[PDB]
Design a protein around this ligand. Structure first.
Ligand SMILES: [Mg+2]
Ligand SMILES: [Mg+2]
Lengths: 255, 142, 267
């Protein structure tokens, strides 16, 4: 848990350094993808030097294998890309290392605020030396929902709207900074009570789901199942609020 | 620190003396026999009182054994945690030892939570946890 | 040079924000109490408001002050007002969500003249003075140059104090989600207005906002190329608390889109 985490942390460090460096060339749709590729490539170099056996899984490069196919590196060098496209500073790098059909290492690093959340299965998820103890809410009273509008899954638009309508009738308020990984980190660190989003992808939540579960929370799909890994339908938070949310949101779904 | 142990050891009358840690009274099995070269240093306990000491010593060993077998059983897989289909007595051992001695807190444990369970794979564990979610969250019963 | 009252206001906001940051790293010192709907108010609010009032009275012992807590402290004069929010997004500071700001603006003859908002967590300082513009830490602010409701990002707020409009509100958002790309929700009106003026989000709108929660941001978005209005194109937004703001094209498109979805109570 020490060496893998140290390597991942150094990788996220280099990624965040390059990202923040390139964040100072003001321009007013492509160069964002260029620096994305560059950060992904220096991450790839970090993967090749240290442990050249593991395999890499990126939204961009798909999956690039080596010899140890049992150790997958799921590295999103940027989440909430549109923010960095608009200079809105809410974005992070999400490193994940899955071993034996299961996530084991997780890191989410915002270089702007310098937020470096780490997570090993079992021993838990730390932040800068602090332990994330989830949220204290037992229901949907006065709580905050890290809600995410499906700007890539417009098919479920109206369904999602009715769902969030019922929620806001029941719950208190939403938040959306346009960064799934950071949303998961925040709901993990008790900064926002509950979280739920539609149509996500493994390279996005790969680390955040572990960050949440290690914080006395759970991650599931809209039907309590465990296929949210690929169905992109995720609800997360400490179990009280997740139960209180599912009990209200089940009866207006379509999947 | 033995005040709960020697409650009734030399207990034909407790106003004789407190037990002796000069020989130890802290092995309880290798102390089944200590010769009379050192067991003449006790006072106020004649030979019938010595046989009563042996009887109450068997009783004290019974007390320590009972405390052992009662503190061990911090598992208590209950009927509400045994009735669960697919959850036998042994899976109930392992689950109530995992850290959830109930069902409501059980529906609040994911796959990786209930992984490494003796007698359950990953997929069937997930199916059972989903069934527990049906019986605690989805069914909407109380 | 630098507008005088603007300098006093930014110094006061700096001190208040430093106190805010000080209270932030201590999740023990905050001792809040609930006052409205799904939100507390902390002792930190009182401390920061006190610091701001004192720093203002130091160099202005007669100006009128306005605050959510102290209502309206009528100084010996009543033409120079200081609308103050020592915290926008107290809900976030409760949960220590690092996204909030202090807000200070000055009204002269009813017209906002200078305004500042301050995010201590990112050390961002949105200043804006009338007839000279808005600045972010020393850079000009022009707002998003987007020309239509396509690909835009829309900042909004849910009416946790007036949830009756929610349904209507929902429909509005729903309608908007037909065209716009994504929304934003930070629970901080002032920072939403700033981001609009910052060109970070390409449009903002909210139903039923408090007067001292935009009177600083509205001058920012004004002098940053953007415009503000109510949901019917009028100037009564200061009373209704119903705000839309952003560059002229996106504001016009939003108003055209919402003319139907809206309810007659709001118009
Ligand atoms: Mg990505
Ligand atoms: Mg306020």
């Amino acid at each position: 848990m020490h060496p893998m985490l140290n390597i991942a942390v150094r990788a996220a460090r280099k990624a965040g350094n390059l990202i923040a460096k390139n964040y100072e060339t003001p321009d007013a749709n492509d160069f964002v993808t260029n620096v994305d590729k560059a950060a992904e490539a220096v991450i790839i170099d970090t993967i090749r030097k240290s442990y050249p056996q593991h395999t890499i899984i990126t939204e961009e490069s798909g999956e690039l294998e080596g010899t140890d196919q049992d150790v997958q590196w799921v590295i999103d060098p940027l989440d909430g890309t549109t923010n960095f496209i608009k200079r809105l500073p809410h974005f992070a790098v999400s490193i994940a290392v899955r071993i034996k059909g299961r996530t084991e290492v997780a890191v989410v690093y915002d270089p702007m605020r310098n937020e470096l959340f780490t997570a090993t299965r079992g021993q838990g998820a730390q932040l800068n030396g602090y332990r994330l103890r989830g949220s204290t809410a037992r229901d949907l009273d006065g709580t905050i929902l890290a809600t995410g509008f499906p700007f890539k899954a417009k098919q479920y638009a109206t369904t999602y709207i009715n769902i969030v309508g019922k929620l806001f009738n029941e719950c208190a308020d939403f938040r959306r900074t346009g960064s799934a990984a950071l949303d998961l980190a925040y709901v993990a660190a008790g900064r926002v009570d509950g979280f739920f989003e539609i149509g996500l992808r493994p390279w996005d939540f790969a680390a955040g789901e572990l960050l949440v579960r290690e914080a006395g929370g759970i991650v599931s799909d809209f039907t309590g199942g465990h296929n949210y890994m690929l169905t992109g339908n995720i609800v997360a938070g400490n179990p009280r609020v997740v139960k209180a949310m599912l009990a209200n949101m089940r009866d207006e779904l379509s999947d | 620190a033995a005040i709960d142990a020697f409650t009734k050891y030399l207990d034909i009358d407790e106003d004789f003396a407190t037990v002796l840690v000069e020989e130890g009274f802290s092995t309880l099995e290798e102390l089944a026999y200590v010769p009379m070269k050192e067991l003449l240093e006790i006072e106020g306990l004649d030979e019938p009182t010595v046989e009563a000491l042996r009887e109450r010593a068997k009783n004290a060993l019974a007390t320590i054994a009972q405390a052992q077998e009662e503190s061990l059983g911090d598992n208590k897989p209950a009927d509400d945690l045994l009735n669960l289909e697919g959850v036998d007595r042994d899976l109930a051992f392992k689950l109530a030892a995992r850290g959830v001695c109930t069902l409501e807190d059980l529906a609040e444990q994911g796959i990786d939570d209930l992984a490494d369970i003796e007698g359950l794979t990953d997929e069937k564990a997930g199916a059972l946890i989903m069934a527990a979610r049906n019986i605690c969250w989805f069914g909407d019963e109380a």
